[PDB]
Design a protein around this ligand. Structure first.
Ligand SMILES: [Mg+2]
Ligand SMILES: [Mg+2]
Ligand SMILES: [Mg+2]
Ligand SMILES: [Mg+2]
Ligand SMILES: [Mg+2]
Ligand SMILES: [Mg+2]
Ligand SMILES: [Mg+2]
Ligand SMILES: [Mg+2]
Ligand SMILES: [Mg+2]
Ligand SMILES: [Mg+2]
Ligand SMILES: [Mg+2]
Ligand SMILES: [Mg+2]
Ligand SMILES: [Mg+2]
Ligand SMILES: [Mg+2]
Ligand SMILES: [Mg+2]
Ligand SMILES: [Mg+2]
Lengths: 76, 117, 136, 177, 51, 68
RNA sequence: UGCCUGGCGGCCGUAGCGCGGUGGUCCCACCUGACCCCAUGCCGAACUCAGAAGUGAAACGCCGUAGCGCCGAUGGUAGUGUGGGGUCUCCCCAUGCGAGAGUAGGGAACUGCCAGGCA
RNA sequence: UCCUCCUAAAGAGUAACGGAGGAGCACGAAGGUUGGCUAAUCCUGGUCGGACAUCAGGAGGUUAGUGCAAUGGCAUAAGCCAGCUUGACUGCGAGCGUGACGGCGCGAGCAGGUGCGAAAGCAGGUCAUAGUGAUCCGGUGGUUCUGAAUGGAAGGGCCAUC
RNA sequence: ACUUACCAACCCGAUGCAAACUGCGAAUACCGGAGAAUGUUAUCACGGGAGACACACGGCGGGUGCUAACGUCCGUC
């Protein structure tokens, strides 16, 4: 019975794209599940935010037998 | 789940965690007849040192190749071989076997001989 | 009269109807009745036309209906303000794009299917044309 | 253990020459015997299960695992996780000693026994059978039984076919038709 | 919502307390948990009390 | 086989009736001993029901008619 | 240097499943035994130990093999950025990008470090 | 008021008395860690047993499961057991995200002390996203603060909390 | 327990349809690095003064309405 409701947008998504240079700690993705998984020099917080563990350049790759999306950070 | 595939599944997590850490791992492999040890570099694709009961130099001194006493010799050997190659700090990859029988004899022996883990 | 037996949702955004048809060959029968215009066929339209072609052949041969009205259409009645919620589902259409094979038929002489498809054609709100099976 | 020997000393020989297997490892092997009691009504009497397990325990010679409902379903008015049966998996020595007691002194104590089915095979060589009365087992003290109760037997085998599976059992002169 | 607030109190002399909740019904006994007392800077047994 | 939770399990001896082929077996039953130090218990065994024991019945199971 | 095995990886279906064939000196596997280390919401099944009588049956590996999966053009078709137009719910022209599906066709992986066995 | 999907035009965001749904809780384990495990559904066989309980085999391959709505995730399991436990730690915090603001969030790393593990290592609650109420006034405990002549006290501040 | 012109989900092959379907998937858009030309710094910060928070038609993409309204609500020019 009756519609009319929604919730605030959570402003998720990619925050730094391929190549963007970041200082450690910078959030690279906000996500709900692990669409992107954390790779080298990247951390995964409790809401599956991927963040930088090192200064460097953001690098998206696809790795492994499940073709999962991975984010790493290359030193620059 | 078929013994082999099951053990590997048991092992995958610790190894990815180990890959992330960049550790040079001391990887053990057990079989009913033999025990094997490889010190593998962080890239995962080059073995720096190795010893096992499959090399004649080792088995010659052993009663039976597949037991705890033999594993203790293998442990002692890799440790020595690794130190002569300058290697000291490693991490143990029990590779899905329980840390317990033979496997535990081997680690203790590498540790008895100065290998750091 | 055709209608989805059940659906995931009651109602559907209006949407649009650009594009060319899919399913454009006589793929079941020997002859077909093909769409030339863009538009909506109602469940009742499919029926008014289906009866006629079936009358027309004295229930001989065989008939296929290639379209199905899975789109719910709503309406707001007299004396209703705009808004205050979406209308109620009143009827169902299938969206037709130029080229849709609507009906197929076989087991009858070419001459008779044309009469029958001609009779149905008078019941539909979109221009149609008569087609035949084709190798390749 | 006597019947493991009859398997080794005598059955292999019979089966190799029966099916002309190339390797002795093709000969069907009895892998395990699993006893089960579908209790079903402990949901009302929590105590009916305890007495069933102990019946199996003296029958099989080991503490049974009591099996819970894999899935709630209202048809038998059972909630998930409700104890609703008990089981025993027999292997090695214990399995064989049971196999003997079964043929040598239980099936004979079946009421008006006339033989067992030979068609109760699952189609890939395993045999399953029921008993109506657990009082056929002499580990059961007729005076003490709270209640007569039945029992599932399944002999899981390594035959690939029923024809092979039957010869294994047949070769023990297992009572049939 | 039926879940009551309680305080766990330091078994040392300090009057340090952590705060939590409890289903006081089903689990009526007193919650007792080792936690860090920042006043003695050591881990100590903490024992449920009222709020 | 798991210490301290199972049902004894001895090598019992089983005595049969009008036939002198006892067997000895695992079993858990309780009775009273003899020869080399075992158990005993008189039933009516496999070599007895007339589809194991093949023919010869008679005994004290039942019959099927008297004379004629 | 070669063939074979085993262990750690790269790649992540051209790399898989099937179907067939195939190997046991070594490896490997089933295996033998189990009091005990150690284990089983019961079970030496699995974990684990001591072993080496038997087997390549299963599994595993290798070889083949297009029944699948998988891969996949050319052309055309859909769409679409900008500009312009029409009979403007939709379409068309110039120009740029240009799918998906389908077709031809490929395809029975390829590869590094280490170690053992045969030659 | 808040959460989830769609509308929403492939970054974010985006209206309507548009289209569906859901929260105002729960858990001292359903939190931590070490070790371990792998669903659903169908066929065949099986005492009482049935279309459906428990047992076995095969097929299958996550269609299961997640305390609950939706979406997104999850096998290295985040899904299912067990042992030992209190990291459901105190002080901080590079650097970020999101917000008119008030705020909200993510966060390696440092110090102290701690649990699990042989160890590398994990742990600052729960697979994530709802489960909520600013200020004032006032209660309770603590306190190297303040204490209207002076020492106290009352009141006040400061930390915790209701 | 046997059987019927019956009605039949699953599965196989053939064919459509989906805002809340995806084993695929653009054009544009947006974020980032470098670089030249051009552009009255067009950018950013702080600081003084504001106004404004009724919007309208048209085009493209849409929800709603009848792909009705000089209708109505968003996005974009
Ligand atoms: Mg074994
Ligand atoms: Mg074979
Ligand atoms: Mg293509
Ligand atoms: Mg968006
Ligand atoms: Mg957009
Ligand atoms: Mg684990
Ligand atoms: Mg059944
Ligand atoms: Mg420790
Ligand atoms: Mg949980
Ligand atoms: Mg005064
Ligand atoms: Mg004073
Ligand atoms: Mg300004
Ligand atoms: Mg206003
Ligand atoms: Mg306004
Ligand atoms: Mg406006
Ligand atoms: Mg207007």
């Amino acid at each position: 019975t009756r519609n009319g409701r929604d919730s605030e947008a959570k402003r998720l998504g990619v925050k730094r794209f391929g190549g963007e240079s970041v200082l450690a700690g910078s959030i690279i993705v906000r996500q709900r599940g692990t669409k992107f998984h954390a790779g080298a020099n990247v951390g995964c917080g409790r809401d599956h935010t991927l963040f930088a563990k090192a200064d460097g350049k953001v690098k998206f790759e696809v790795k492994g037998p499940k073709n999962r999306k991975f984010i790493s950070i290359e030193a620059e | 789940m078929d013994k082999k595939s099951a053990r590997i599944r048991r092992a995958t997590r610790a190894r990815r965690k180990l890959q992330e850490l960049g550790a040079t791992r001391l990887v053990v492999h057990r079989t009913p007849r033999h025990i094997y040890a490889q010190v593998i570099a962080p890239n995962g694709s080059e073995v720096l040192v190795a010893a096992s009961t499959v090399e004649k130099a080792i088995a010659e001194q052993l009663k039976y190749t597949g037991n705890k006493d033999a594993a203790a010799a293998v442990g002692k050997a890799v440790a020595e071989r690794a130190l002569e190659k300058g290697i000291k700090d490693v991490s143990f990859d029990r590779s899905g076997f329980q840390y317990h029988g033979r496997v535990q004899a081997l680690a203790d022996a590498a540790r008895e001989a100065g290998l750091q883990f | 009269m055709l209608q989805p037996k059940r659906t995931k949702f009651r109602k559907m955004h209006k949407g649009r109807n650009r594009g060319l048809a899919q399913g454009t060959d006589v793929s079941f029968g020997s002859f077909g009745l093909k769409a030339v215009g863009r538009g909506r066929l109602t469940a009742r339209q499919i029926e008014a036309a289906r009866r006629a072609m079936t009358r027309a052949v004295k229930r001989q041969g065989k008939i296929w209906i290639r379209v199905f009205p899975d789109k719910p259409i709503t309406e707001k009645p007299l004396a209703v303000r705009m808004g205050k919620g979406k209308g109620n589902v009143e009827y169902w259409v299938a969206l037709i794009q130029p080229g849709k094979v609507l009906y197929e038929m076989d087991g009858v002489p070419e001459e008779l299917a044309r009469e029958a498809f001609k009779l149905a054609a008078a019941k539909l709100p979109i221009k149609t044309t008569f087609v035949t099976k084709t190798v390749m | 253990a006597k019947l493991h020997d009859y398997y080794k000393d005598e059955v292999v020989k019979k089966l190799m020459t029966e099916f002309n297997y190339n390797s002795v490892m093709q000969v069907p092997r009895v892998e395990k015997i699993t006893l089960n009691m579908g209790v079903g009504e402990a949901i009302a009497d929590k105590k009916l299960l305890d007495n069933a397990a102990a019946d199996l325990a003296a029958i099989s010679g080991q503490k049974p695992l009591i099996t819970k409902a894999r899935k709630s379903v209202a048809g038998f008015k059972i909630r998930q996780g409700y104890p609703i049966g008990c089981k025993v998996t027999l292997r090695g020595e214990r399995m064989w000693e049971f196999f003997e007691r079964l043929i040598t002194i239980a099936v004979p104590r079946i009421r008006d026994f006339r033989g067992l089915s030979a068609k109760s095979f699952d189609g890939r060589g395993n045999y399953s059978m029921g008993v109506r009365e657990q009082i056929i087992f002499p580990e059961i003290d007729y005076d003490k039984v709270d209640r007569v109760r039945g029992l599932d037997i399944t002999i899981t085998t390594t035959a690939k076919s029923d024809e092979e599976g039957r010869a294994l059992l047949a070769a023990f002169d297992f009572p049939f038709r | 919502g039926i879940r009551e607030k309680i305080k766990l109190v330091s078994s040392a002399g300090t009057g340090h307390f952590y705060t939590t909740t409890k289903n006081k019904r089903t689990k009526p006994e007193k919650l007792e948990l080792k936690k860090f007392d920042p006043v003695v800077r050591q881990h100590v047994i903490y024992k449920e009390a009222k709020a | 086989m798991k210490p301290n939770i199972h049902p004894e399990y001895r090598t019992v001896v089983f005595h049969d009736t009008s036939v002198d082929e006892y067997f000895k077996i695992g079993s858990t039953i309780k009775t009273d001993r003899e020869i080399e130090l075992d158990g005993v218990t008189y039933p009516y065994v496999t070599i007895d029901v007339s589809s194991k024991s093949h023919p010869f019945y008679t005994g004290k199971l039942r019959t099927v008619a008297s004379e004629g």
